[PDB]
Amino acid sequence: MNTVPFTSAPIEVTIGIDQYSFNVKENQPFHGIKDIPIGHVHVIHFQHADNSSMRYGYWFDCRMGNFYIQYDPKDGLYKMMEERDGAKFENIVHNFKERQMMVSYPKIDEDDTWYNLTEFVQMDKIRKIVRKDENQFSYVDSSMTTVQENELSDPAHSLNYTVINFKSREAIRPGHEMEDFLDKSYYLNTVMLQGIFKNSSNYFGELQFAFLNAMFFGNYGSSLQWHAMIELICSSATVPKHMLDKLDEILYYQIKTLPEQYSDILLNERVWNICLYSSFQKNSLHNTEKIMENKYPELL
Amino acid sequence: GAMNSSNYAELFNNDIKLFVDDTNVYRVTVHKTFEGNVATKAINGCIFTLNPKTGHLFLKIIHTSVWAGQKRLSQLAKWKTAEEVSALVRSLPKEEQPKQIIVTRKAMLDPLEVHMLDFPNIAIRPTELRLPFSAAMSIDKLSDVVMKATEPQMVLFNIYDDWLDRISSYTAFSRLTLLLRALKTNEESAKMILLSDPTITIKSYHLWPSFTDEQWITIESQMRDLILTEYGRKYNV
Numbered sequence: 001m002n003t004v005p006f007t008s009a010p011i012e013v014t015i016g017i018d019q020y021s022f023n024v025k026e027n028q029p030f031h032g033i034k035d036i037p038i039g040h041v042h043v044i045h046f047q048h049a050d051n052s053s054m055r056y057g058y059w060f061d062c063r064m065g066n067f068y069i070q071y072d073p074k075d076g077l078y079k080m081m082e083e084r085d086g087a088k089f090e091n092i093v094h095n096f097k098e099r100q101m102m103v104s105y106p107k108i109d110e111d112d113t114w115y116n117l118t119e120f121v122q123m124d125k126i127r128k129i130v131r132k133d134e135n136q137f138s139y140v141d142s143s144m145t146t147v148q149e150n151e152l153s154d155p156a157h158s159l160n161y162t163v164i165n166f167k168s169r170e171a172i173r174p175g176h177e178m179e180d181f182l183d184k185s186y187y188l189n190t191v192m193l194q195g196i197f198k199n200s201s202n203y204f205g206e207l208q209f210a211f212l213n214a215m216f217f218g219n220y221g222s223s224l225q226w227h228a229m230i231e232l233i234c235s236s237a238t239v240p241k242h243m244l245d246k247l248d249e250i251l252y253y254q255i256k257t258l259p260e261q262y263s264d265i266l267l268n269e270r271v272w273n274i275c276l277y278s279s280f281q282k283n284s285l286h287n288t289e290k291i292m293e294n295k296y297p298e299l300l
Numbered sequence: 301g302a303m304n305s306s307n308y309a310e311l312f313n314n315d316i317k318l319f320v321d322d323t324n325v326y327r328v329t330v331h332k333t334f335e336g337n338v339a340t341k342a343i344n345g346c347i348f349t350l351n352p353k354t355g356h357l358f359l360k361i362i363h364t365s366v367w368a369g370q371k372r373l374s375q376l377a378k379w380k381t382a383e384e385v386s387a388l389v390r391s392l393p394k395e396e397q398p399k400q401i402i403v404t405r406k407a408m409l410d411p412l413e414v415h416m417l418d419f420p421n422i423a424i425r426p427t428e429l430r431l432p433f434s435a436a437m438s439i440d441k442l443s444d445v446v447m448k449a450t451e452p453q454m455v456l457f458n459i460y461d462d463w464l465d466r467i468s469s470y471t472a473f474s475r476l477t478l479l480l481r482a483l484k485t486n487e488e489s490a491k492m493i494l495l496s497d498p499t500i501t502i503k504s505y506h507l508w509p510s511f512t513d514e515q516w517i518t519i520e521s522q523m524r525d526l527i528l529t530e531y532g533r534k535y536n537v
């Protein structure tokens with residue numbers, strides 16, 4: 001188990017760690033998060049008490065370095081940094097742990113929720129969507145736009161998700177206009193899976209990362225990408241059986257974790273009704289359909 | 301975006317544009333079978349592609365063989381229309397290609413957009429005008445060429461005959477829409493209004509009779525009366 005210590009907490013803030021969250025008071029003796037499970041990526045995220053504008057946060061993997069958080073009073077935010085002095089790091093953490101100044105990552109033993117949400121998400125792929133090569137961790141916030149959003153404006157601060165556009169020359173072979181528009185299998189299997197992602201695991205990783213950024217930061221372009229990657233599969237007549245079964249599991253745990261009160265803004269009625277009730281794959285997502293109908297029947 | 305009565309004069313400016321109406325592409329008769337079921341029989345159709353400024357009509361005749369062994373024909377017809385309009389645009393010299401294509405039915409937007417991806421600067425637009433272009437097959441010479449076709453064929457017409465020698469394209473389009481609306485509402489009565497006087501004839505190279513300016517005023521008034529008469533019969537007014 002690994003640790004993300006905090007130098008201090010000078011401003012009141014709600015702190016998230018993966019799907020958990022807690023409140024820290026202004027100048028409270030908080031010095032970080034311990035017992036973080038090794039083997040998964042993680043995200044540590046923030047919403048200031050005095051200004052809920054800009055949710056922001058950091059994706060990281062404790063296997064890739066020793067990371068800590070320190071508040072910057074000039075830029076007005078909690079910043080992740082890497083400590084290269086290993087013995088300094090351990091010495092600081094030990095003082096903080098001995099004085100019980102850290103919260104414990106509160107994982108129930110029965111609970112696979114975080115694994116189920118991040119099964120295909122790897123740090124190396126995150127760092128290609130979020131480009132800041134000098135850091136081993138990745139900053140994301142609520143207002144960051146996507147490359148596709150910027151084509152329709154600072155490129156250094158953008159989310160480089162794979163562009164999906166159903167009415168584009170990439171999606172439609174000349175001479176196969178009706179076929180390719182009504183059955184997106186070409187676009188899914190040849191263009192996206194064989195060509196760009198190389199395999200379904202990378203595709204699902206980006207889909208899962210998009211969802212998590214929509215949920216944890218309210219990032220709109222991430223929500224658009226999540227829905228586009230679902231619709232591309234559901235609108236394809238020919239999808240490998242293992243992908244359909246895995247997608248049903250992926251979406252089930254996403255819909256299970258979504259805050260009930262954020263559904264009006266995180267779920268696109270058109271896409272979900274099309275995917276569950278009209279698409280080629282309308283009968284292939286049994287678990288997702290059942291949780292959607294029992295949890296959000298109004299959307300449908 | 302959409303095209304309506306606020307921006308109506310835009311149809312007659314100097315930016316090349318085409319209306320596309322797909323109503324008559326897939327045409328069927330419905331009949332009983334020997335076993336008492338119901339079956340369709342397709343008949344020849346046409347795409348109505350019109351330049352409202354010049355009167356040039358590109359009538360692509362859709363022969364029933366294009367439907368042979370195909371499924372979901374009402375859906376296919378929209379994509380066949382878009383395929384043929386795209387092929388027409390590609391066949392025209394650059395300086396004759398339209399800057400806008402206006403579809404009379406919104407279901408044509410996505411098929412035409414997809415077939416025209418290679419032409420990102422041609423705008424594909426709907427319209428809020430309810431245009432009576434379905435009644436094109438009530439123009440005898442258009443119906444005759446479509447029904448006699450034994451293979452796919454494109455035929456070119458000027459749907460304004462020689463009117464633009466004497467009137468503007470705004471007035472010519474208004475006359476055409478009034479005539480087509482009347483033919484749509486009561487075809488026999490409209491055909492009788494158009495052909496009752498035997499001394500006024502249709503030139504070999506025209507679609508409509510050779511009315512003088514004053515006679516066109518009379519005909520237009522008779523057509524408006526027909527439409528109002530039919531509205532009164534319909535709604536009991």
Ligand SMILES: O=C(O)c1cc(-c2ccccc2)no1
Nearest residue numbers: 491492493494495496497498
């Ligand atoms: O030129 C023709 O073919 C024509 C004219 C008429 C006609 C008949 C009744 C009343 C008015 C016109 N029928 O055929």
